[PDB]
Symmetry: C3
Subunit: 231 residues, 3 copies
Amino acid sequence: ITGRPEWIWLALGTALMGLGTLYFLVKGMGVSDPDAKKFYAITTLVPAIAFTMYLSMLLGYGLTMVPFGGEQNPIYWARYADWLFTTPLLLLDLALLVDADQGTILALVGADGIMIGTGLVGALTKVYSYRFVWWAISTAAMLYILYVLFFGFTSKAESMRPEVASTFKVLRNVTVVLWSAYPVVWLIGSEGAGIVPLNIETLLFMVLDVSAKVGFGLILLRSRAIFGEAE
Amino acid sequence: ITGRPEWIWLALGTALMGLGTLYFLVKGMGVSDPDAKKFYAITTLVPAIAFTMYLSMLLGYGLTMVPFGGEQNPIYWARYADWLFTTPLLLLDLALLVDADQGTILALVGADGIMIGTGLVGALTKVYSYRFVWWAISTAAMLYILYVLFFGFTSKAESMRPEVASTFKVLRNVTVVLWSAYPVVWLIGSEGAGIVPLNIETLLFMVLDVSAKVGFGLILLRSRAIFGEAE
Amino acid sequence: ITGRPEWIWLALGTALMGLGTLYFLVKGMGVSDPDAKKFYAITTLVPAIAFTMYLSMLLGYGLTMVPFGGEQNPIYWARYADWLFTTPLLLLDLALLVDADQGTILALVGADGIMIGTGLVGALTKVYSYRFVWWAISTAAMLYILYVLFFGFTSKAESMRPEVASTFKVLRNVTVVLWSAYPVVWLIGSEGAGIVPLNIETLLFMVLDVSAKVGFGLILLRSRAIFGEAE
Ligand SMILES: CC(C)CCC[C@@H](C)CCC[C@@H](C)CCC[C@@H](C)CCOC[C@@H](CO)OCC[C@H](C)CCC[C@H](C)CCC[C@H](C)CCCC(C)C
Ligand SMILES: CC(C)CCC[C@@H](C)CCC[C@@H](C)CCC[C@@H](C)CCOC[C@@H](CO)OCC[C@H](C)CCC[C@H](C)CCC[C@H](C)CCCC(C)C
Ligand SMILES: CC(C)CCC[C@@H](C)CCC[C@@H](C)CCC[C@@H](C)CCOC[C@@H](CO)OCC[C@H](C)CCC[C@H](C)CCC[C@H](C)CCCC(C)C
Ligand SMILES: *C/C=C(C)/C=C/C=C(C)/C=C/C1=C(C)CCCC1(C)C
Ligand SMILES: *C/C=C(C)/C=C/C=C(C)/C=C/C1=C(C)CCCC1(C)C
Ligand SMILES: *C/C=C(C)/C=C/C=C(C)/C=C/C1=C(C)CCCC1(C)C
Ligand SMILES: CCCCCCCCCCCCCCC
Ligand SMILES: CCCCCCCCCCCCCCC
Ligand SMILES: CCCCCCCCCCCCCCC
Ligand SMILES: CCCCCCCCCCCCCCC
Ligand SMILES: CCCCCCCCCCCCCCC
Ligand SMILES: CCCCCCCCCCCCCCC
Ligand SMILES: CCCCCCCCCCCCCC
Ligand SMILES: CCCCCCCCCCCCCC
Ligand SMILES: CCCCCCCCCCCCC
Ligand SMILES: CCCCCCCCCCCCC
Ligand SMILES: CCCCCCCCCCCCC
Ligand SMILES: CCCCCCCCCCC
Ligand SMILES: CCCCCCCCCCC
Ligand SMILES: CCCCCCCCCCC
Ligand SMILES: CCCCCCCCCC
Ligand SMILES: CCCCCCCCCC
Ligand SMILES: CCCCCCCCCC
Ligand SMILES: CCCCCCCCC
Ligand SMILES: CCCCCCCCC
Ligand SMILES: CCCCCCCCC
Ligand SMILES: CCCCCCCC
Ligand SMILES: CCCCCCCC
Ligand SMILES: CCCCCCCC
Ligand SMILES: CCCCCCCC
Ligand SMILES: CCCCCCCC
Ligand SMILES: CCCCCCCC
Ligand SMILES: CCCCCCCC
């Protein structure tokens, strides 16, 4: 484990995702509202999945070597197995908050799968220049997601209860800022141009992951928007 | 790329799926009917997924070598990753058109997963004679799907609006004819008996894919069956 | 095939899953109740999936070698591909029986995916002591599932029709007893401590699989709880 300088950030990430999972699990014990139960189930699964994948990276299972640039490059593939399941769950939290229609939910989840799937292909591609073709396709899929979150959901939240509109607006802004950083870290990190070393890259993804999952969840599960209007 | 004679058909397929995706995306911009939005989302995702997998084959990522018959045989595995997601989406288009019940939808999607999954196992199997055992199981799963589309959905469409009944009947006939060709191309192509060479096999799958996805989508999204009855 | 002593139990399992699939398929022909159709579709898919994965193990495709303990250990990875899809389908049978809320269904299916996913990682892990870390995480996920089936569903079934309450109680008890045996067989078998040899381990999993899928299905599909109350 300790033979890799980035191990400290993988261990911290593992701990923070595990602690986040347990807090949400305990906090959700005393909840019977069927609407609130939906948000607790979605939001608790997110850091639980991330916990297992951070642990796999810490123990060395989620790491492979990819030859490109005449070098064997360490690629943590477990990140994409994490994101494949956690990013659509996070979008479902937002879509259920605004009572989005089914067709829009399917478009979001499908574009998200394309985003993560093409990012994985780009991470494992051995022809250096082709890695950035996949990065560009994946980034186009992300821009579609961000467009929908702004010019489809925002207008839908305003016609909703005030507390669900204000909570959505906050979580929307958090998501757009944090998610946009991921393609940048990829491009300048060891998967892309190799400007930033792997140990610093790992620290950046850990800050982003914890903020986008545990920070996101703390804002959502403390809001009254997750409960139905009741007397 | 150009070192493979089949590259021209992979490049054409990539272009036609990309163009198809963009047309459906633009055409769906001016749509607010929640029913129509469902069909546009399903139908636009189909060629978008196929685009990415054709590109992976063009660039050489979606290709592996499988030893059988005393030879290293080029097997494009990316086809099955495509079909795993696009064939159930196409069946969902048909099932939603006739307002099929949930139990029937699950049976269709499950049989479809078995069809594609066993076809993938057959494509990667190293014992030559066993490849055709998997082909037979996969073909049995397809025949179940075709039976349901005829002796379960057809009777359901007649009790529906006339425009949804006539549109379903057309898309049903297109699907049964085109899908039935796939097991035949597999059997006589490089995955099976090896009668037809890979470059011709690739041309045939490209014609079938574009017809079953973009041609299918053009018929559906030009129909009024996708809109609810409104004044 | 016959070069492996466990082949006899893989062949028996294949036959019993295939026969089970055909019986459920025939029995479900004469069913039009939309509620009953749901249970028949879920319950017939379970042994059909298991059939294909037992066949892959029989023919040698679903087997790999994992080095640990200074030895190349035969690991049947196809079991986890089976369980990944069949265990959530079995939980869906139970959840639909008691009309569970959506949030609870998602929590069950998500915990089940974590259970199977971490068990697969543990089966393929090359550092011997780490294999049991994954076993423990997977077992914690199972205990969560069992808790929900007892202290969330049981109370919900009592407020239901008497026949659905008594049928659920029976299937609940069958599930908790049979599922609990799996982590024990893993721990003492070739994936874990290696006390029980592989051929005996394979026999035990076959008895458990057939009971948990075909036996489970025979109890459910003979009950009147799967039909709506009708005159
Ligand atoms: C509606 C939305 C959900 C739609 C989703 C969008 C999606 C279509 C976007 C594209 C996804 C696609 C790129 C997934 C590729 C997975 C692949 C990286 C797995 C590893 O295989 C890659 C190479 C080794 O580098 O295999 C070496 C050769 C091996 C012999 C490969 C044989 C196994 C194949 C991988 C079998 C295909 C399985 C499916 C891809 C499983 C789904 C994986 C997940 C990442 C989507
Ligand atoms: C309700 C419906 C959706 C049900 C679906 C029906 C489905 C059950 C039908 C059978 C599907 C099954 C054959 C999928 C097999 C995937 C497999 C080809 C992936 C590549 O692995 C094959 C060998 C190399 O040749 O791995 C070499 C050895 C490696 C060490 C393998 C270890 C990884 C395992 C593959 C882990 C299992 C992952 C799941 C199979 C992922 C789903 C893939 C998709 C193709 C279903
Ligand atoms: C809501 C719920 C459904 C959530 C589900 C819970 C889930 C997150 C729990 C953890 C699942 C995770 C451990 C799955 C790992 C699959 C992995 C074993 C496949 C084989 O790859 C392992 C190594 C060889 O030993 O690959 C060698 C290196 C290769 C180069 C690997 C590159 C391919 C990657 C495997 C791509 C990721 C694909 C996804 C993991 C596909 C889903 C598989 C299924 C088992 C979940
Ligand atoms: C909890 C994890 C989250 C919210 C991860 C989000 C990840 C992304 C938005 C990743 C995007 C990428 C691109 C847009 C292209 C480059 C490759 C990716 C996958 C890093
Ligand atoms: C857009 C792609 C489509 C509609 C693909 C359809 C593919 C099939 C219907 C494939 C069927 C197969 C068999 C029936 C057995 C032989 C292997 C397959 C997977 C080619
Ligand atoms: C039809 C198959 C069924 C119902 C299989 C159930 C399997 C389990 C409940 C497996 C559980 C495991 C653990 C709890 C940890 C050890 C590894 C597993 C996956 C065997
Ligand atoms: C979206 C965030 C990207 C900003 C990356 C900042 C990295 C600064 C760290 C110093 C770079 C290390 C280079 C010298 C080793
Ligand atoms: C009462 C609110 C705080 C509860 C404690 C939460 C502990 C989980 C770890 C959170 C750290 C990361 C927060 C986002 C920066
Ligand atoms: C379902 C369509 C299958 C028909 C295949 C027709 C192939 C004819 C092309 C000529 C065969 C090439 C053999 C000589 C190289
Ligand atoms: C107005 C209808 C035609 C629009 C142009 C569609 C261009 C997408 C490519 C379609 C070619 C394949 C059609 C099926 C044979
Ligand atoms: C949950 C069931 C686990 C019980 C396992 C009993 C196995 C007894 C078979 C004899 C053990 C073989 C050891 C000598 C070869
Ligand atoms: C009339 C009920 C029996 C029908 C025959 C079922 C045959 C399928 C194989 C069942 C054997 C396994 C039963 C569970 C132990
Ligand atoms: C194995 C991959 C299957 C999933 C394909 C994605 C489409 C799923 C459609 C689900 C239809 C709704 C069923 C109720
Ligand atoms: C990782 C594979 C999980 C999918 C298994 C297929 C069954 C899914 C059941 C979904 C139940 C409906 C939830 C609302
Ligand atoms: C185009 C939709 C408007 C909202 C999206 C904001 C774009 C942020 C740019 C992200 C940069 C990634 C490289
Ligand atoms: C048996 C259901 C009737 C409709 C299915 C038509 C069968 C077409 C044969 C396809 C040939 C594939 C080898
Ligand atoms: C803790 C929830 C109560 C019901 C679960 C029964 C636990 C059975 C123990 C299984 C042993 C697996 C190692
Ligand atoms: C080795 C660098 C080659 C540059 C390729 C950049 C491709 C980016 C595509 C974005 C449209
Ligand atoms: C090398 C050819 C061996 C023939 C096997 C055919 C199997 C087909 C099974 C269809 C029932
Ligand atoms: C080689 C045996 C090492 C023992 C590790 C046991 C780990 C079990 C963790 C359960 C909390
Ligand atoms: C609940 C605390 C979980 C912390 C265990 C993971 C941290 C790795 C320490 C080496
Ligand atoms: C929108 C046009 C997309 C065409 C790019 C793919 C074709 C491959 C050319 C080499
Ligand atoms: C319907 C009977 C299915 C039996 C075939 C599988 C058994 C393997 C025999 C070698
Ligand atoms: C993106 C930063 C999240 C901050 C988490 C703190 C929330 C406390 C209510
Ligand atoms: C299967 C052939 C499809 C033909 C596509 C043309 C549709 C234009 C309306
Ligand atoms: C767990 C044992 C199941 C027994 C199956 C027999 C059911 C006949 C109704
Ligand atoms: C009005 C809410 C502002 C939230 C933005 C937070 C950016 C990290
Ligand atoms: C909408 C604000 C985008 C912020 C992008 C930050 C990328 C590091
Ligand atoms: C009555 C519609 C006929 C459609 C069949 C088209 C076959 C390619
Ligand atoms: C229902 C007509 C089937 C046509 C099969 C064509 C196979 C090449
Ligand atoms: C295995 C075939 C079953 C025969 C019919 C059983 C009575 C519905
Ligand atoms: C009251 C029903 C008892 C069922 C338990 C069966 C254990 C195999
Ligand atoms: C609730 C009874 C548990 C039985 C466990 C059996 C494990 C072999």
